[PDB]
Structure 1
Amino acid sequence: SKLEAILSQEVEAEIQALLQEAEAKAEAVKREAEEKAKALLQARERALEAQYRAALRRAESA
């Protein structure tokens, strides 16, 4: 009936706000990892880069 219709219609509109929410609670995790990861690969370019330039200089300086 139309009575049972209103209860359906409510429940579904609520359902979609949970599901989209669920996506967002994931999305931040997904994107957090990405951001974290960027900081790992870069930070290791840095240290190793110093271990390069400075290695050759002292080698030349020697």
Structure 2
Amino acid sequence: SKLEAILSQEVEAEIQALLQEAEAKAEAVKREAEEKAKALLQARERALEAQYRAALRRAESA
């Protein structure tokens, strides 16, 4: 019957909202990582080069 149909009618749109929330919750996890990984590695590239050149320079000073 139709009564319980309204109970149906309520659930289906909620199934979709769990998903929409979820979708955003996977993506964000993904995106938090994207910037973070990229941003440290830059710094560690940077740092390693300087920690080299200045030595070689100081070596040139020898």
TM-score category of the 2 structures, normalised to the smaller one = 0.7 to 0.9
When the two chains are superposed, the root-mean-square deviation of aligned CA atoms in Å is 1.6
Structure 2 length-normalised TM: 0.78
Task: Report deviation, 1:2.
Answer: 4.1
Structure-1-length-normalised TM-score: 0.78
Identity %: 100
Q: CA deviation at 1:5?
A: 3.5
Equivalents in 2 of 1:50, 1:5: separation in Å?
Answer: 70
| Structure 1 residue 10: Cα displacement | 2.3
Aligned length, in residue pairs: 62
Compute the displacement of 1:53 (Å): 1.6
5+ residue gaps, structure 1, are: none
Q: Which runs of 5+ in 2 are unaligned?
A: none
Distance 1:25 1:33 in 2: 13
TM-superposed CA distance for 1:43, in Å, is 1.2
In 2, the alpha carbon distance for the partners of 1:12 and 1:23 equals: 17
